[PDB]
Design brief:
Elements (H helix, E strand, L loop, with lengths): L3 E6 L16 H7 L4 E3 L5 E3 L2 E6 L5 E6 L13 H12 L10 H4 E6 L4 E6 L6 H5 L13 E2 L2 E6 L8 E7 L3 E6 L12 E6 L3 H10 L4 E4 L6 H7 L6 E4 L4 E7 L9 H10 L2 H8 L5 E2 L22 H10 L12 E2 L2 E2 L1 E7 L3 H15 L4 E7 L1 H10 L4 E5 L8 H6 L6 H6 L5 H12 L4 H17 L3 E7 L2 E4 L23
Parallel strand pairs: 1-12, 19-20, 19-21
Antiparallel strand pairs: 2-3, 4-5, 5-7, 6-7, 8-9, 10-11, 11-12, 13-23, 14-23, 15-21, 15-22, 16-22, 17-18
Helix pairs in contact: 7-9, 14-15
The structure holds the ligand COc1cccc(CN(CCN(CC(=O)O)Cc2ccccc2SC)CC(=O)O)c1O, chloride ion (CL) (3 copies) and fe (iii) ion.
The site of ligand 9YH has 9 residues, from loops.
PDB class: metal binding protein
Keywords: dioxygen activation, oxidation of carbon-carbon double bonds, metal binding protein
Assembly: monomeric
Length: 498
Amino acid sequence: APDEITTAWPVNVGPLNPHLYTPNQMFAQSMVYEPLVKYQADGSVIPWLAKSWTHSEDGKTWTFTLRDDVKFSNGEPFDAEAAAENFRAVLDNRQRHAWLELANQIVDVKALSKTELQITLKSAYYPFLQELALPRPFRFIAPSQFKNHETMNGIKAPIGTGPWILQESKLNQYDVFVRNENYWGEKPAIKKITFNVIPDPTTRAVAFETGDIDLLYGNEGLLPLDTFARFSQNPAYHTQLSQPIETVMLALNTAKAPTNELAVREALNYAVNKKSLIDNALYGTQQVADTLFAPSVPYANLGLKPSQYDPQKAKALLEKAGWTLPAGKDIREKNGQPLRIELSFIGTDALSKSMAEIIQADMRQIGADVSLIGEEESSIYARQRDGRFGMIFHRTWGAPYDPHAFLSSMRVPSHADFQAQQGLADKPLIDKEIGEVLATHDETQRQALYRDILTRLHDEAVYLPISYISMMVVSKPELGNIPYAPIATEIPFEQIKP
Ligand SMILES: COc1cccc(CN(CCN(CC(=O)O)Cc2ccccc2SC)CC(=O)O)c1O
Ligand SMILES: [Cl-]
Ligand SMILES: [Cl-]
Ligand SMILES: [Cl-]
Ligand SMILES: [Fe+3]
C-alpha cells in the first residue's frame, strides 16, 4: 504494498542531470533535486535549502544563509561550497540557459562560509527568487558527481538532497524511485514509485483499466478525454480535474504572408468557435481562452476585449482588407494570391490533429484555406525556432513562469514567440519593455509595463488563444485525494497519503 505505487509517463525520466533539459523530465528532476527557496501557490517563495536571505539596498547583492543539517542522498554534506559549485557548473553552460534571464543576470556566486552563500546580479532582477525556485537549472547535485568538475558534459550518479532517489532506469521500459530514508525534511508516505514508459494516451488508459498502473497524472494529453469523462463516472475509479494551469493557443506569424496582415490575424481570432472546439475535441473538459494569459494570472487582469466567435465579423474584416471571394470559389484572394495559411502540429498527436481539423474547418467557413502540416516532433520544434510556420500550436508555461518568464523568453530569437512577433513594427519596443519590466521595482511602472506588453500582443492579434487547460488525475481510489503542486510542471508525490 500500500506504500508502493505504479504510474506512467510517455518517456523515461532521463539521466536526471539537474542542469540540463531534454531528455530530462522536470517533474523527476524536482523529485531528486531541491531549490534554495521553494515556490508557493500564492506566488511567494519560502525558505528551503536556504533558511534565510538578505539583499543589498541596490538589490543586486544577495546573501543566503543555508541550512546546516542537509545531506545529499550519498551522505556528503550540502553546504555553501556545494551550492556555489553547482551555480558555476550551470553558468559554465550559460548559453544554453539564454531563455532564463537570471542565467544572464548572475554576475558571481561564492561561498562566504559553510553556511553563507552570496549571489551577485547585473541588475535588480525582481523575479530572482522565483527563478531559483524552478525545477531546473538552479538545483543541487553532489559536486562529487560532476564529470571533470562540470555537469554540462554529463554527471555520474544523480545524487540530490530531495525526498526521492532514483533506484534504477531502463530505457523505454521504466524508472523506479524510492523514498530518501535520510531526507532532511518530511518523510513521504509512499516508499516506492515505479514509472512505466507508455507513450500512447490510449495505451495509458488501457494500462489503468487493466490494473497495470495505479495512477495517471498529467495535462490535457494524459489520456483520451472521452475516456477520462467515462472514468469520472465509473465508481471503481477516482478522477480529478484541476483549475486551469496554463493557456493553449495558436501563434500566428506576423512576419509571413498572409498572417503578416493585422486584419487577417484579427479575422482568424473571430473565426474559431472555441466553445464548440472544446466540446468537440476536448470533450468539454477545458475552459475557453480569450487572452494570452487568463485574467487570474498575475499582472494580466487588464480588461482586454475578447474576440468572440463571429464568422460575420471575420468575413467583413477580410473583405475590408481586400480579401474577397472569386466567382465560384470558397477561398478568398487578394492580388491574385489565395488566403492560404499553413498550420503546423505534431502529426502523431491525435488531440492536436483533432483541434487542427476543427480550426481548418472553422476558418474555411470564412474563406481561409488552412493547410494542415503534421510532422514529427523534431521538425515542429525546428519550425518554431526558425519561424518556418504560418500558424503553430503553442502553450504558456504555468506557474511560476507565467507571465514573467514566458514574456522574458519572447526576446530569444530561437523561440516561437519571438519568431511569431518578428514582423511587428513595435517588436523592438516590446522587447525593450520586457527587459525593463523584469528589472523594475517601481510596482506602478511594473504593472504599466506588463499592461503595455500584453495589450500590444493582444491588439496585434499575435496569438489565437484557445483554451485554459487543467491538470488531470486518474487513480485507484485507495490512493485517496491526489494533491497538485504549486509549480505546474511538478508532481507532488511526497504529498500523496493513502
Ligand atoms: C513541460 O515543459 C515546460 C514546462 C514549462 C516551461 C517550459 C519552458 N522551458 C524553457 C526551456 N526550454 C528547454 C526545453 O524544454 O528543453 C526551451 C525550449 C527549447 C526548445 C524547444 C522548446 C523549449 S520549451 C517550450 C523550461 C524548461 O524546459 O526548463 C517547458 O519546456
Ligand atoms: Cl521532452
Ligand atoms: Cl539557442
Ligand atoms: Cl524601442
Ligand atoms: Fe522547456
